[PDB]
Design a protein around this ligand. Structure first.
Ligand SMILES: CCCCCCCCCCCCCCCCCC(=O)OC[C@H](COP(=O)([O-])OCC(O)COP(=O)([O-])OC[C@@H](COC(=O)CCCCCCCCCCCCCCCCC)OC(=O)CCCCCCCCCCCCCCCCC)OC(=O)CCCCCCCCCCCCCCCCC
Ligand SMILES: CCCCCCCCCCCCCCCCCC(=O)OC[C@H](COP(=O)([O-])OCC(O)COP(=O)([O-])OC[C@@H](COC(=O)CCCCCCCCCCCCCCCCC)OC(=O)CCCCCCCCCCCCCCCCC)OC(=O)CCCCCCCCCCCCCCCCC
Ligand SMILES: CCCCCCCCCCCCCCCCC[C@@H](O)O[C@H](CO[C@H](O)CCCCCCCCCCCCCCC)COP(=O)(O)OCC[N+](C)(C)C
Ligand SMILES: CCCCCCCC/C=C\CCCCCCCC(=O)OC[C@H](COP(=O)(O)OCCN)OC(=O)CCCCCCC/C=C\CCCCCCCC
Ligand SMILES: CCCCCCCC/C=C\CCCCCCCC(=O)O[C@H](COC(=O)CCCCCCC/C=C/CCCCCCCC)COP(=O)(O)OCCN
Ligand SMILES: *OP(=O)(O)OCC(C)(C)[C@@H](O)C(=O)NCCC(=O)NCCSC(=O)CCCCCCCCCCC
Lengths: 62, 178, 55, 110, 175, 124, 67, 459, 88, 80, 104, 128
């Protein structure tokens, strides 16, 4: 009774939505398409371990 | 809205209506209170200037020019009371007004609630039923043979009578029914 | 805009009354757009719907 | 705009409710001290709407004006935009002056 | 996933960057992600694994229907109704398959546009070219047939196009 | 703005037309011009997914600013130096554009003056 | 909270509403002053507008009217 | 197909052998069961139709029409038993017999393989409707309206017969499959022009096409509730079904001969929509809205594109359901106040709130509120017409603007405002009427989730 | 909540309060049943201003055909009570 | 509830702009009979009201004090 | 129907009609939910003149401002890689005319 | 003395500016009295049925039936073919049809001629 509302109106709906998305929606191709993450010089790739080279010796007009 | 209208408005009523309308529009123009009092005294003096004119043609002409001046100088957005015909709450509560005869269609389970109210309603219905013929007879006897010249209605004249055509006037729903 | 609006608002405190100008009448009546466009086209359409289309 | 416009409307509704469903500003007098919280809320909202610096509306409206000022723009459009920017403060002043300043003009039953 | 074919629905290798923090402040996104994983993800995967165990106890299969190749409308006689009917049915099936091919190409194009972000104009030229070619072929085949279309009308359209191409080739050869 | 008043109220042929500009070769008066240098490579700009309008000669500072945004996310008040550097680079680009505008304007007011002087020298 | 109509007198007021209004007004003014003292360049600008008349004809590559 | 026809026939001895107080219950129950059985026809193929035998076949175009026709009969029985209470048992059974015969004729008409049988049943549908209108109507005009219903149709349908028996004398068959497979182009000659006119105008009259639409505001107004329901929901769609069927043999002449009918339809949309704005009669307003909606289907069929055909099918089904519901809602008010004047009874939302909700839903569906199938059909027809011609968007959209105007006006006049004072006999809505509106509106919203069921053979 | 349930005594008090604030009316001679013409020696233009003062007092507008008839404070109180459905 | 109207004899136009209106009307030979009816709008808590600029600067003093104390603290704390 | 007295005790107050009185041929157009013919503070043919004049003046001023635009004393914005030719559509097998930007 | 107000169809003349209410004759007063008498008799006839306790249903208004009948059923019997009626009918029923036919025919012929010579950019026009 302290937090019954938070499980009947939030937790159950998010459980159902997560199940439907994870195991039914993504079972088909191109259903959930995400924007490509931004890659900047000096970043490290988590898949291949590649390191992006730095950005070519700034003129350094400071 | 209760008084029966007349066939025409006399000169005095027209001048009084013009005075009230001009004062209202002047208050609309003069927002501040002291300024409105000043110019209302000025307007009252202007009206009293011709308070004792005995030339009816001259009085009618003066009223005509006053009306023309008012129409030229009226406020395009005069102040209107909220429940007035032009106000922001004119017919706001009409959707909540329900006629009383609908209570006759209530289910007996609904009438089980509010028993005293429905007993009093039955008393009122009996009182209405018992006095209709007398009201009809009074209307027939008082009305001239040609017909009613105005919409004014006569009051009850004997002891145990009610004024003719009283049910719908008395049993108005409310001004704030809900 | 703040200063002119405040000045013309303080102007209303004076004990002077004068009839409105045509610019104020245009501004207050919404450029006479509802007073014209809600009356002429609607009247013409509702009159043609009965005089010719229906009758 | 969503924030301060919605809260300005709630302040207007609060005034209307407190003045017995009266919406004409000509019958609203001195509410600066009678309704301090509503008064301060409407003052903050009018300041934000007019583009007071470092308020919410400053970060969008002033940049909009500066962007119109440095674009290949129709000159009449720029002039009308500036005049509208002035008229915004004009009607904000109208609202504040006729709703919160001066002497009361509502029915005496407070 | 293995549900669909990766050759028919390709996507780039999905390069992602490793988290490299600079400030000492905590990341609310990481805390909320951990909360979502502990509170939402785990019950869902438990329920799904239970459902999968239940499904594995009853394994039955369904098959893709194979349709033989029947003679087309070009090999049918003028008023021979049976081969005409069979060829028309085969043509309708081919029309539906072509529609679905166009649909697959369009899905590729949509996924390209969403995935590439702000570089979609440059990084999706191949998808646009494939869609242009497929759309041109489909327009040459089935466009302007209208309602009450049939294999005969498509054959007549192809014959008219072939006459136009032959005339154009003859005109070009005269130069 | 003054240039608007001079172009619209004065002689239009004495001032540049922004749509058709520049009308003179880049080496008409300069003895030697070095090509403008770009730091960020095309692949870096493509991977950073910069807007096409954002892909200018100041793109490297913008890339640094975006990287510092992403790195220190909860502290949204940390990239003062990067934002300042990007703004300074854009300011330099704008002053270069103004320099080009002024050069073109004075080239136009010099060319027609020279032609009119040559014509006046050939009156008789 | 229970306040009565007053009929031609100033309405009854509570301490909480007055202190809340004053506190929020002071908060807004403090925010404005703090941001101005920290982010003046957002209003007064950060870089100066150069004067085109101050640019030499050698900076812009301009021949001395004889070539 | 006989598994649906034979129970409909068996409804007659059932009705005639039932008790004096049990006809309505049994008829409603068994008609609903027949509707449940007819629901099985929705399992269509993607290439060719369901050829049950040499005589009857079912395509994706006629399956929704069959389902709607079978579904309408229980609603007609529910709506008719109120005003037929004082009627004698024999005349009640005669009315139910008329309804059953109409349903059987429609069932056979929508499934006939051969055109002459289709014409025979499509003309046989006239007799029960005429009998119902001229016998159980309420006013003296019901006779004249009946004549308008009888001679408008026949004058258009008699040449059609002369055309059909002519075609079989040249091609050798009138079977629809043979006609489709052995189709040949129509030459541009006066004889072919008049054969095109003969094969078309019979279906234009039943739509009705603007100009030949005068019979409808009479027949729909003076008919009883069930007569108007069957006229609006199903009988108007016979012209569309026949025209969609017969436009196969008319190409390529349809490119040239459709211009007058297209112009008539696109201008009649505006004319009828404007007429709806000034109508003192509610039933007449609904009748005119029916013509305004059918002009769109006429245009869609005339322009001859797959999107237009899908839109026409969806719009036909949606308009049938919507017009039936609107006629029921108007009849509920009429049975209280005994007058069809729209402004006589006002402010009914205060007195009948749930009926006001039904009115609101019907009005919203009428003006094609998305994602209702009305909107789907209208939008498909609009896109097909825009492909046909861009300038068409000027008219259709205008019609849309008028369509929302007279609908909500119709809602405002009867439901909003203040109640009229002198009326005091407005009883609470019965369970029968509320169930009737619920059964009218729930399938309408259910069809949104599965639009492909009502998109025709072109899907 | 909203405005209190105003009563007959409140209406009479407010009407007499507004009338007593009128300079042309002597507060001592004023009574509930005091006629505006006979007892107080006023004119029609004065009655119009009294009606307007009543309207400003109670925040609602009285139609002129109803306003002309109200000749003593008791009539004004009765009219306001009939307007606002006040029974006590 | 359970409240009665204030005394009507206290509503005097004294010290209010109604005096100004009365004097300019007496300079014309006329009088204001409704002047007292409005005196309540100038008598009690409504006697004095703030101006527009004062209204805008509602909490400027407290906010300015907080701003200056915070700035003074931070400026000297930054000199570690 | 709006011009009729709103303070009269009409038999139909919303419609402002009395029982038995003759009804206008065009009542449904004047129902006051619709076309209004009430007198206005400013006469017709003057409001029309003012509105048409304001609209025409606005249109003419907008056209004039289009003819005389407003801009800043700057040159065109310069983009490095052939004005971003590869990004702005592509076609990498063309090698377009080099656009050259020099320092100033 | 002031700018005069002139009435229009959609902005009628106000009652206070109408001279008819400022030139009164005994016959004018008699006409006003007769109008009031008719209105009062109609009001009494309505109120007698309105307040009747025995009455249950809708009070039938002959004016409303007359209005509806005149608007719907009385039109054709009172129609006569006249040059004005014939011209108005021909215009409003024939002109729009041929105007739209001409517009659509012109547009479609232009489009078909563009298609025939193959310059319309019909790419990606799969659906129709
Ligand atoms: C999107 C919302 C999500 C909802 C979640 C799921 C809800 C399922 C509801 C299904 C429909 C209900 C059945 C219709 C008849 C109502 C029965 C009734 O008598 O009510 C008495 C009942 C008892 O209350 P009462 O006190 O006795 O009232 C008595 C008085 O009459 C007092 O009556 P009242 O004043 O209370 O009025 C009744 C009420 C209810 O009356 C109605 O009009 C509801 C019917 C909707 C409009 C119908 C015509 C318009 C054409 C659109 C068709 C949409 C079809 C979608 C598929 C439907 C599937 C069945 O009216 C309204 O609330 C206003 C209606 C205007 C809605 C405008 C929005 C349209 C577009 C919205 C999106 C639609 C697609 C969603 C997906 C989009 C992409 C994600 O009242 C209720 O319980 C409320 C009814 C349910 C509210 C529905 C409102 C939104 C539903 C839209 C379509 C549903 C989509 C579901 C998919 C999930 C999303
Ligand atoms: C930074 C460098 C720039 C410096 C610029 C120079 C410095 C400023 C310049 C001064 C500009 C105007 C400033 C004074 C404001 C006017 C206030 C006033 O009292 O006016 C008196 C009078 C109205 O007073 P009233 O009727 O006695 O008051 C009645 C009671 O007070 C009723 O009392 P109430 O309580 O109802 O209050 C009524 C309302 C006042 O009632 C009104 O509505 C009248 C005020 C009209 C405001 C119009 C201002 C802008 C209009 C733009 C229009 C564009 C073209 C439209 C022309 C269409 C032609 C058909 O009072 C207010 O609420 C406050 C007024 C607003 C003050 C703030 C305005 C500031 C913005 C304007 C100045 C621009 C500064 C920024 C510019 C930056 C650009 C770089 O209006 C006028 O006579 C003048 C209006 C000004 C424009 C009208 C032009 C003449 C119209 C006909 C011309 C011939 C046409 C021939 C046919 C052609 C056909 C093609
Ligand atoms: C209220 C609504 C009722 C329904 C309305 C139905 C509309 C029916 C109209 C039929 C449309 C087309 C019919 C004939 C096609 C063309 C008609 C004619 O205008 O075109 C010219 C025809 O030329 C002349 O105009 C001949 C026709 C003139 C005589 C006909 C009288 C038309 C007057 C309108 C009568 C009203 C119709 C409705 C009657 C109630 C073309 O010139 P041409 O190239 O040589 O002929 C080509 C046709 N060929 C190939 C068969 C030879
Ligand atoms: C494409 C078509 C373009 C539009 C052409 C004109 C459309 C005309 C519609 C005719 C409809 C007739 C029946 C409407 C029902 C009658 C009605 O609603 O009553 C009028 C009612 C009452 O008036 P109120 O002021 O609200 O209240 C007064 C009482 N206190 O008001 C209205 O609803 C009138 C609305 C009509 C709008 C007509 C003007 C619209 C034309 C705009 C054209 C400009 C386009 C600009 C394009 C922008 C650039 C992309
Ligand atoms: C509610 C009003 C509805 C009006 C319906 C009536 C319109 C029908 C149109 C005319 C129908 C007649 C066509 C009959 C069937 C045609 C079959 C056919 O192809 O025969 C033609 C012959 O076509 C005809 O003979 C038909 C001519 C018309 C005769 C009757 C005239 C009736 C009025 C015709 C014009 C009106 C049409 C539009 C009516 C408008 C109604 C508003 C060719 O035959 P062959 O002799 O073999 O020629 C080839 C070998 N040389
Ligand atoms: O005291 P009562 O018995 O009630 O009657 C008083 C009255 C004087 C009306 C009557 O006794 C009488 O004798 N009337 C004679 C006619 C008469 O007075 N004619 C003159 C008309 S008054 C007038 O001209 C007022 C001038 C002011 C113009 C008003 C317009 C205001 C401008 C608009 C402001 C926004």
């Amino acid at each position: 009774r302290h937090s019954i509302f938070a499980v009947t109106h939030v937790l159950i709906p998010v459980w159902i939505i997560h199940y439907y998305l994870k195991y039914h929606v993504t079972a088909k191709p191109y259903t959930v398409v995400e924007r490509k993450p931004r890659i900047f010089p000096g970043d490290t790739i988590l898949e291949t371990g590649e390191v992006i080279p730095l950005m070519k010796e700034f003129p350094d007009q400071h | 809205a209760f008084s029966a209208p007349a066939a025409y408005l006399t000169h005095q009523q027209k001048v009084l209506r013009l005075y009230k309308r001009a004062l209202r529009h002047l208050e609309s123009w003069c927002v501040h209170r002291d300024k409105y009092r000043y110019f209302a005294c000025l307007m009252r003096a202007r009206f009293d200037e011709h308070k004792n004119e005995k030339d009816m043609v001259k009085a009618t002409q003066l009223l005509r020019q006053a009306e023309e001046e008012f129409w030229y100088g009226q406020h395009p957005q005069p102040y209107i009371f909220p429940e007035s015909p032009g106000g922001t709450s004119y017919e706001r509560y009409e959707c909540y007004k329900v006629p009383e005869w609908c209570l006759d269609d209530w289910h007996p389970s609904e009438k089980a609630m509010y028993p005293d109210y429905f007993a009093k309603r039955e008393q009122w219905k009996r009182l209405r039923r018992e006095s209709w013929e007398r009201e009809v007879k009074q209307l027939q006897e008082e009305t001239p043979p040609g017909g009613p010249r105005t919409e004014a209605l006569p009051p009850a004249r004997k002891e145990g009578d009610l004024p003719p055509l009283w049910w719908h006037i008395v049993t108005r729903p409310r001004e704030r029914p809900m | 805009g703040f200063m002119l609006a405040l000045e013309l608002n303080n102007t209303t405190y004076y004990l002077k009354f004068k009839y409105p100008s045509q610019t104020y009448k245009f501004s207050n009546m919404l450029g006479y757009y509802p007073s014209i466009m809600h009356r002429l086209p609607t009247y013409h359409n509702l009159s043609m719907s009965q005089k010719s289309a229906s009758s | 705009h969503a924030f301060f416009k919605a809260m300005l409307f709630m302040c207007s509704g609060s005034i209307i409710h407190s003045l017995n469903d009266e919406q004409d500003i000509r019958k609203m007098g001195g509410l600066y001290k009678a309704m301090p919280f509503t008064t301060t809320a409407l003052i903050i909202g009018s300041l934000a709407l007019t583009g007071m610096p470092y308020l919410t509306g400053f970060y969008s409206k002033d940049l909009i004006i500066e962007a119109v000022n440095m674009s290949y723009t129709n000159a009449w459009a720029l002039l009308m935009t500036l005049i509208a920017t002035s008229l915004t403060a004009a009607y904000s002043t109208r609202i504040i002056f006729f709703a919160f300043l001066g002497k009361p003009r509502f029915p005496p039953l407070v | 996933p293995d549900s669909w074919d990766k050759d028919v629905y390709p996507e780039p290798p999905r390069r992602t960057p490793a988290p490299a923090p600079q400030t000492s402040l905590p990341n609310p996104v990481t805390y909320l992600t951990k909360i979502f994983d502990l509170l939402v993800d785990r019950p869902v995967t438990l329920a799904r694994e239970f459902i999968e165990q239940q499904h594995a106890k009853n394994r039955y299969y369904y098959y893709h229907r194979e349709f033989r190749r029947v003679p087309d409308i070009t090999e049918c006689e003028e008023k021979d109704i049976l081969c005409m009917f069979e060829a028309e049915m085969q043509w309708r099936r081919d029309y539906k398959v072509d529609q679905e091919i166009v649909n697959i190409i369009q899905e590729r194009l949509k996924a390209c546009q969403q995935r590439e972000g702000e570089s979609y104009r440059q990084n999706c030229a191949k998808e646009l070219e494939q869609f242009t070619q497929v759309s041109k072929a489909f327009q040459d085949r089935y466009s302007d047939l209208g309602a009450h279309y049939s294999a005969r009308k498509c054959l007549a359209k192809q014959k008219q196009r072939m006459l136009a191409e032959r005339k154009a080739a003859k005109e070009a050869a005269a130069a | 703005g003054a240039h608007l008043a001079r172009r619209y109220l004065g002689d239009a042929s004495k001032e540049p037309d922004p749509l058709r500009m520049p009308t003179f070769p880049p080496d008409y008066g300069f003895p030697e011009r070095k090509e403008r240098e770009m730091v960020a490579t095309q692949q870096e700009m493509n991977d950073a997914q910069l807007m096409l309008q954002q892909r200018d000669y100041c793109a490297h500072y913008l890339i640094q600013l975006l990287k510092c945004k992403r790195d220190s996310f909860p502290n949204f008040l940390a990239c003062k130096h990067e934002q300042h550097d990007w703004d300074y680079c854009e300011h330099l680009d704008y002053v270069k554009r103004m320099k080009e505008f002024e050069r073109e304007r004075r080239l136009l007011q010099r060319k027609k003056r020279r032609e009119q002087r040559e014509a006046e020298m050939a009156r008789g | 909270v229970h306040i009565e109509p007053r009929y031609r007198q100033f309405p009854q007021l509570t301490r909480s509403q007055l202190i809340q209004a004053e506190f929020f007004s002071a908060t807004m003014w403090f925010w404005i002053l703090w941001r101005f003292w920290h982010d003046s360049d957002a209003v007064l600008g950060h870089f100066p507008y150069p004067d085109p008349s101050q640019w030499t004809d050698e900076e812009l590559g301009i021949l001395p009217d004889d070539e | 197909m006989l598994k649906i026809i034979i129970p409909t026939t068996m409804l007659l001895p059932m009705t005639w052998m039932s008790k004096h107080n049990m006809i309505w219950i049994n008829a409603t129950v068994h008609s609903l069961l027949i509707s449940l059985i007819s629901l099985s026809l929705l399992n269509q193929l993607g290439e060719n139709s369901l050829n049950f035998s040499l005589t009857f076949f079912s395509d994706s175009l006629s399956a929704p029409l069959l389902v709607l026709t079978t579904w309408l009969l229980p609603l007609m029985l529910m709506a008719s038993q109120s005003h037929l209470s004082k009627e004698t048992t024999t005349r009640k059974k005669l009315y139910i017999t008329m309804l059953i015969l109409l349903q059987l004729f429609l069932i056979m008409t929508f499934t006939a393989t051969e055109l002459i049988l289709f014409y025979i049943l499509f003309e046989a549908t006239l007799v029960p409707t005429l009998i119902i209108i001229t016998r159980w109507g309420n006013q003296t005009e019901r006779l004249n309206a009946g004549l308008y219903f009888l001679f408008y149709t026949l004058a258009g349908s008699l040449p059609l017969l002369v055309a059909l028996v002519y075609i079989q004398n040249t091609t050798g068959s009138l079977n629809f499959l043979i006609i489709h497979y052995w189709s040949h182009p129509l030459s541009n000659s006066w004889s072919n022009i008049f054969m095109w006119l003969a094969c078309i105008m019979a279906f234009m009259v039943k739509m009705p096409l603007y100009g030949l639409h005068l019979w409808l505001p009479k027949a729909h107004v003076e008919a009883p509730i069930a007569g108007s329901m069957v006229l609006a929901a199903v009988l108007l769609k016979l012209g569309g079904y026949g025209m969609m069927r017969i436009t196969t043999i008319l190409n390529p002449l349809t490119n040239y001969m459709a211009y007058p009918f297209l112009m008539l339809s696109m201008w009649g949309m505006i004319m009828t929509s404007s007429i709806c704005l000034r109508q003192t009669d509610l039933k007449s307003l609904i009748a005119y809205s029916s013509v305004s909606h059918m002009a769109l289907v006429i245009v869609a069929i005339m322009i001859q594109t797959p999107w237009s055909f899908m839109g026409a099918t969806a719009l036909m089904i949606a308009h049938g359901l919507t017009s039936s519901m609107l006629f029921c809602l108007a009849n509920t008010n009429y049975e209280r106040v005994h007058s069809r004047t729209m402004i006589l009874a006002r402010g009914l939302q205060t007195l009948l709130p749930l009926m006001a909700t039904w009115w609101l839903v019907a009005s919203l569906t009428n003006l094609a509120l998305p994602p209702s199938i009305n909107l789907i059909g209208e939008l498909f027809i609009i896109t097909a017409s825009f492909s046909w011609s861009n300038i068409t968007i000027i008219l259709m959209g205008m019609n849309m603007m008028i369509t929302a105007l007279y609908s909500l006006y119709m809602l405002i006049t009867t439901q909003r405002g203040k109640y009229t004072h002198h009326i005091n006999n407005i009883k609470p809505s019965f369970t029968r009427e509320n169930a009737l509106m619920a059964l009218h509106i729930l399938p309408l919203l259910l069809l949104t989730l599965n639009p492909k069921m009502i998109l025709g053979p072109l899907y | 909540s909203d405005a209190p349930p105003l009563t007959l005594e409140a209406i009479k008090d407010r009407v007499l309060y507004v009338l007593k604030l009128y300079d042309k009316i002597d507060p001592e001679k004023l009574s509930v049943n005091s006629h505006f013409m006979k007892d107080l020696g006023l004119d029609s233009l004065d009655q119009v201003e009294i009606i307007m003062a009543m309207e400003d007092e109670f925040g609602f507008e009285i139609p002129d055909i109803d306003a002309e008839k109200l000749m003593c404070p008791q009539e004004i109180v009765d009219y306001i009570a009939d307007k606002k459905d006040v029974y006590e | 509830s359970k409240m009665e109207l204030p005394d009507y004899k206290q509503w005097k136009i004294e010290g209010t702009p109604l005096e100004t209106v009365q004097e300019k009307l007496a300079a014309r030979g006329l009088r204001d009979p409704w002047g007292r009816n409005e005196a309540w709008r100038y008598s009690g808590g409504f006697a004095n009201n703030v101006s527009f600029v004062g209204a805008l600067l509602k909490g400027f003093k407290w906010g300015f004090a907080a701003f200056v104390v915070a700035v003074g603290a931070e400026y000297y704390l930054e000199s570690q | 129907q709006q011009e009729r007295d709103p303070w009269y005790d009409w038999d139909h107050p919303d419609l402002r009609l009395n029982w038995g009185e003759p009804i206008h041929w065009d009542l449904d157009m004047y129902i006051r939910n619709r076309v209004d013919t009430s007198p206005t503070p400013v006469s017709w043919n003057t409001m029309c003149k003012h509105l048409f004049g304001f609209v025409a003046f606005m249109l003419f001023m907008f056209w004039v401002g289009e003819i005389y635009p407003s801009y800043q004393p700057v040159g065109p914005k310069q983009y490095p890689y052939n004005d971003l030719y590869l990004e702005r559509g592509g076609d990498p097998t063309k090698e377009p005319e080099p656009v050259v930007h020099y320092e100033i | 003395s002031f700018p005069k107000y002139k009435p229009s169809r959609l902005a009628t003349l106000p009652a206070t500016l109408d001279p008819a209410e400022y030139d009164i004759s005994p016959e004018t007063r008699k006409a006003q009295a007769e109008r009031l008498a008719i209105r009062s008799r109609l009001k009494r006839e309505y109120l007698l049925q309105y307040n009747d306790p025995n009455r249950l249903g809708v009070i039938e208004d002959p004016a409303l039936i007359r209005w509806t009948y005149a608007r719907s059923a009385n039109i054709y019997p009172n129609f006569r073919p006249t040059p004005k009626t014939s011209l108005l009918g021909a215009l409003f029923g024939i002109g729009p049809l041929f105007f739209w036919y001409y517009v659509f025919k012109t547009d479609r012929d232009k489009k078909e001629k563009l298609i025939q010579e193959g310059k319309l950019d019909q790419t990606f026009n799969i659906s129709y």
